[PDB]
Amino acid sequence: GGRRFSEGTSADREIQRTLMELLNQMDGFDTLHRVKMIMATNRPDTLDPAL
Amino acid sequence: TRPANHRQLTFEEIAKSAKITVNEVELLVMKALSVGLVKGSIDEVDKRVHMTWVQPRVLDLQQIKGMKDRLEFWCTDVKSMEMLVEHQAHDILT
């Protein structure tokens, strides 16, 4: 999930790409019907507000 | 009977050959066109009708002489006009 970064290490680049694929795939240009998403966490503090 | 030259008769001629008045011949020929035995047009102001197609009839061995003769010199028109084609179009293809 992550929040975002100001791009420190080289690993979280493509992981932010992986997350931004997910966010557009949730409700971007699609009838999101009959596909219900249930999530869970212990800390909802390190999350993207866009997520 | 009328040739392919004119075949354009008049309502006075229908009033002559059928002895029926002027105010009924149009009601006759609309019925002839509705049946479809004849196909042509009707002028009213010059009292003439442009008959084009007639119902084809039967004929004896005398009419095939005339259709024979009208076929005969129609042969040599195709001969004569194609003769210019092979003569003037000679060298264009061997």
Place this chain on the structure above:
Amino acid sequence: HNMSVKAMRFPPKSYNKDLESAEERREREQQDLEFAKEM
């Protein structure tokens, strides 16, 4: 048009040599194809 065709084929001249490919490069191409056939 025909005069522009007939007054036109005199500058065809000095068309000296249409060499096909070569002789040395043709023998070298035959040698390279010989190496391709040996390989």
Place this chain on the structure above:
Amino acid sequence: IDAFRLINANMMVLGHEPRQTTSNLGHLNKPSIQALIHGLNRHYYSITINYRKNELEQKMLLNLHKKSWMEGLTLQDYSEHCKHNESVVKEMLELAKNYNKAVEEEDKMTPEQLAIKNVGKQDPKRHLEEHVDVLMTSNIVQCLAAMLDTVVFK
């Protein structure tokens, strides 16, 4: 096609070259490099062939493949022939404006640069004489075919 046949691999072990050429008739076609990769010779050989035909077959396939019926004795969509005769000329004007364009950069850089340089954009010269042939053949045929039927038909 190139019909082949086996050669003895025993003679290959003998190192003996087979087939003893007595006629300059087989070494006329050159074998491919791709079949030379394979065993065309080391294991098989080529044969020069031809085909057997006769006048019994030549005429009955020549006179029958592409033959019209009464097609050239027509008028070719008599309202749309002249419509097409503007549907080419209209852009032929602007292509003649490109012919009023491309001549004007002559006596300039040498025309071999005018050979490489014109591989992105169209030329007026070839495209121009194309439509002259198109408009010519579209017109003269319908012109003569229109005028024969006046003579033949009455």
Place this chain on the structure above:
Amino acid sequence: QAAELFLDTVSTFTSYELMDYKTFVTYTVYVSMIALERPDLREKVIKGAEILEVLHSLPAVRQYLFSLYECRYSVFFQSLAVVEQEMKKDWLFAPHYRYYVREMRIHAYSQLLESYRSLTLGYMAEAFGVGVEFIDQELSRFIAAGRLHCKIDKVNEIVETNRPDSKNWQYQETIKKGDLLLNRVQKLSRVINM
């Protein structure tokens, strides 16, 4: 092309060569009155506020333009002698003042004459411009000149008109341009290669 380059008259400015902008207005109206037909005249030069208010200072040119538009035929020749005489005295119009008004005449003739067919010849003297024999000799040189599409009768005293379909007159310029370019390419073809 002169009026078409004079199309705007908006971004055109209080110039150095025409220090009066109104002189530029007179020039573009004198070329436009030939250059465009009634539709263009009944939309373009009649509805422009930028073109109306500058000839609002002009008594003559406003009358000289509107007399053709309001079909005021007899008074049009009066200011026509004025504007043509000024055009004779003017620089840069002195090459073509003779060609200008002979276009204006045949334009004013054709505009009225393409309305009626049975209009007589002794109507135009009192309503259009005086001199019946002047109208006679003036139209004779124009039908005889090959324009002004009508056909005048004489001794029953009536002017007939016709209408040409664009099949002959549109063809005449084609044979003109064909003979011109054939003269051009034949002349060049005699020049090059000796």
Place this chain on the structure above:
Amino acid sequence: GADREVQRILLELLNQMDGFDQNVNVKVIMATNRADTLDPALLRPGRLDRKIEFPLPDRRQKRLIFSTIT
């Protein structure tokens, strides 16, 4: 290499935005969430000139959304 590939991605589009000649009407609309993690070389004129923030409505355009949804 995963970063060098994306580098080569940005070079291609950066060229192809300059491969235009104002004659084609091909309009590129690009929508993001954060403008902070962006190269200003992308935001040069000739490629990018129009910038549209979507600020939050407060009361005025806010009540219109209530009208439309309700």
Place this chain on the structure above:
Amino acid sequence: AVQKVVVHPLVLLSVVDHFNRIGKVGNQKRVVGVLLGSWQKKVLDVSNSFAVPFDEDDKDDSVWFLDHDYLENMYGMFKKVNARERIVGWYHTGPKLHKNDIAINELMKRYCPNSVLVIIDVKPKDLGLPTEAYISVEEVHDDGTPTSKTFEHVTSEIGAEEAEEVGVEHLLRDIKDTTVGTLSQRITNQVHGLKGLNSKLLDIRSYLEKVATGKLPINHQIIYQLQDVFNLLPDVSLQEFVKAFYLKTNDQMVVVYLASLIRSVVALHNLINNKIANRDAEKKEG
């Protein structure tokens, strides 16, 4: 019901090679065979065929035999090698319409509903296409016989295929008047076209041979169409038809005059492109 037929050169030669392979009988034998293929979109197709064993005696020529075992087995082989290929009808060699070809079709109608026949040519000479196909229609009409049946010719042509054109164009190698420009139509339909009208002109002249001497049935169903020919003979030269003809001709030579005007200028540009190759080469090389 049936629009037209499509005939391939493979089956077209594949009848004549059978005429060669039974041409050793000398006396008389007709190539009768089974015609195979499809028909799709109401367009008849002809792809493959073979020939059935057939003999015929001159005395009492109402007797025919087709070996139906040979009809079953080889066609089962053909379905097995090609499930797409199927029956389409039959054919006979067809010089002059032999008499058993009224009930051969009735003999093998139980396989194909439109068991169509094809008449071919073995001695190729005409000014046209010597390929023929009829269709079976039967009639219980007022005149004629109560049991009456007469074949009717559906039009015939040689359909091509992108596969077979390689072999056809390979096997020609003789003459081919391509580069279709201003001259190909002039010979394929203007030299040849009016002579195409020659034979159809001469065919009613061949029917005309019964004025008082020919066959006994006279007209009935021949003369309504003949009357319709002279009736539908076209318009004479009086109308603006003349003036519209002059009009559109006079419009056409505008276009011809234009392109003709362009061509000489094109070759003049080609002349200057040669004088530049003359004067700036003779001083340079020598």
Place this chain on the structure above:
Amino acid sequence: EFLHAQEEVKRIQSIPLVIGQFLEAVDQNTAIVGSTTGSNYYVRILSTIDRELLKPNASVALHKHSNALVDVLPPEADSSIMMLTSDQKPDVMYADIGGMDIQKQEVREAVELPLTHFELYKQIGIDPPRGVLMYGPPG
């Protein structure tokens, strides 16, 4: 005879045609391409290709072994073909977006108004925008 050889040269085309992309040419009728395999090559042509159908980005055709120019291609892209237009609109109306009077009119100014009324931007000459960036808080 030249019409016979004119058709003969296209046998190299066949089916297995190299799928490269045109880059440039050194001279007349000899070019440089880059294949879809990842590498670039100095290749020859086939003469019947109209050379004026070249140089945008249209994919050329290459032989799989000898690797020279075979045939020019109509364009292709796999990504999102062209938004198939039938069941592809997300059927959001302009009335569905309430309270965006500035930005809805403003993006209309920038996107589809030069698309339609091109000659007003041409005639006044105000340099219509190439691309547009839009951003803000999510939702």
Place this chain on the structure above:
Amino acid sequence: DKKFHGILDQGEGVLIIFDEPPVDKTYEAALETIQNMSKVVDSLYNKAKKLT
């Protein structure tokens, strides 16, 4: 003003009305080609007349 066309008679006021769309597209769009080509032959002076 050419918005409607016809004629007007003065003896009794008969308006003979007639219309056909004339041939316009054919002749002039082949005619401006000629004045393009004359400019081309004038441009041929810039590579032929001056040169050879």
Place this chain on the structure above:
Amino acid sequence: LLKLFTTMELMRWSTLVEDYGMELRKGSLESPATDVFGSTEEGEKRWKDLKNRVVEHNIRIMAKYYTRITMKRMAQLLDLSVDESEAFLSNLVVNKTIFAKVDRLAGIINFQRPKDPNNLLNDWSQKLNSLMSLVNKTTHLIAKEEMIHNLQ
């Protein structure tokens, strides 16, 4: 009744209503016929819409078969005024459902008379194609007619 509007020219309106304006009370069928009679304004729209169809059924086939007819003859075949005849022939050609070019100096009206620059030689070419198909029809019919009498 449906035969009259399927078939050819109709007997004006008075020669019809004397034959069918009376059975709309008779038989055992009189009630929607009394929805034609009883309401005199809706029913009037049925006398005048019926009058519209019977005044129109003339005009269709008049436009079909009549090249050029006089105004008085047609108004006599409508049994009403020449002015009402012009009101009938105005609102149908501004509807342009029947094209006609009428006269009001000599009364010489006509139907389907355009300039025809094209359809002369065009329909002439149609006559050519039908002619060549027609001569193609007999040709393959002759030889089988010979084969059914001179085969063997």
